[PDB]
Amino acid sequence: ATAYTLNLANPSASQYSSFLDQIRNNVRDTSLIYGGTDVEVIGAPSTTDKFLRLNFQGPRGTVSLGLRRENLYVVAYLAMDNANVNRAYYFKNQITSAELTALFPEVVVANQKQLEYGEDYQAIEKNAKITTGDQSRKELGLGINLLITMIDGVNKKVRVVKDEARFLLIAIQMTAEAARFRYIQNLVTKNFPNKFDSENKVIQFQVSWSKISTAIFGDCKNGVFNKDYDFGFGKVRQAKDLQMGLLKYLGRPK
Numbered sequence: 607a608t609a610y611t612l613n614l615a616n617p618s619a620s621q622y623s624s625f626l627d628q629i630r631n632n633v634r635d636t637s638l639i640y641g642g643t644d645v646e647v648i649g650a651p652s653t654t655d656k657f658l659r660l661n662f663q664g665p666r667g668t669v670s671l672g673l674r675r676e677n678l679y680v681v682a683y684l685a686m687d688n689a690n691v692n693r694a695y696y697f698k699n700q701i702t703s704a705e706l707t708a709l710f711p712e713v714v715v716a717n718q719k720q721l722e723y724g725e726d727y728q729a730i731e732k733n734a735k736i737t738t739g740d741q742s743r744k745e746l747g748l749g750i751n752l753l754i755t756m757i758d759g760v761n762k763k764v765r766v767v768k769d770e771a772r773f774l775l776i777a778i779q780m781t782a783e784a785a786r787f788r789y790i791q792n793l794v795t796k797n798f799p800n801k802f803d804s805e806n807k808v809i810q811f812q813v814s815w816s817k818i819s820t821a822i823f824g825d826c827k828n829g830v831f832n833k834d835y836d837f838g839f840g841k842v843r844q845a846k847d848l849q850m851g852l853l854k855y856l857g858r859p860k
């Protein structure tokens with residue numbers, strides 16, 4: 607229903623930052639305070655407003671993403687094909703036809719396509735066919751210019767699974783992950799709008815979102831962890847050193 611648009615025709619570091627803040631502010635419950643920190647926390651699951659729409663507006667067309675508000679999971683995307691026909695692709699265990707119709711009304715039922723693979727990184731990475739290094743998403747890099755190039759592979763083109771997969775990997779990281787982790791957002795704006803190399807720390811943050819959220823939720827007092835934590839990139843005692851942008855909903859503080 608609610609849609610936020612990122613203007614990639616005229617990219618601005620401030621516009622990108624405000625875009626991420628709109629996402630954070632949309633899903634957060636301001637009454638929730640985890641571990642005495644000021645970091646925003648995703649509110650309890652809504653039965654009425656379940657999805658959020660993100661538009662990537664370019665000079666030659668617009669590609670859209672559909673995200674689940676309860677956990678920021680990307681569940682679908684909208685892109686015009688080679689015949690300029692709007693088509694929606696979705697992950698099966700994530701959304702229904704009726705919900706997809708409401709999310710992307712410009713797409714007719716017949717043009718809704720269920721994706722052959724899973725929504726998890728491993729499954730998408732397999733189809734991305736990355737041939738160098740560890741063959742994971744880290745090998746693609748990050749950045750505004752990279753996102754623009756990836757959109758070019760799906761905007762008004764015949765669907766190719768390899769290009770679709772690579773687009774999804776970058777789109778998920780530049781939106782959902784950047785919203786959750788300010789470290790990722792800061793790398794994007796520091797190198798704006800260039801493509802740059804990703805890091806092990808970027809991946810380490812991503813795989814430990816739940817762990818970090820649980821640690822702040824139940825083992826942190828006034829921003830200080832009760833014990834030392836190491837999520838892969840070193841020992842952390844102060845929650846602020848994590849530069850968190852959005853915490854996972856784990857209930858209300860006890």
Ligand SMILES: Nc1ncnc2c1ncn2[C@@H]1O[C@@H]2COP(=O)(O)O[C@H]2[C@H]1O
Nearest residue numbers: 679680725726727782812813814815816
């Ligand atoms: N489709 C997706 N959309 C958004 N975020 C994802 C998606 N698939 C995986 N992730 C993230 O990858 C993370 C891996 O570890 P977590 O269980 O802590 O939390 C997971 C999610 O936050």
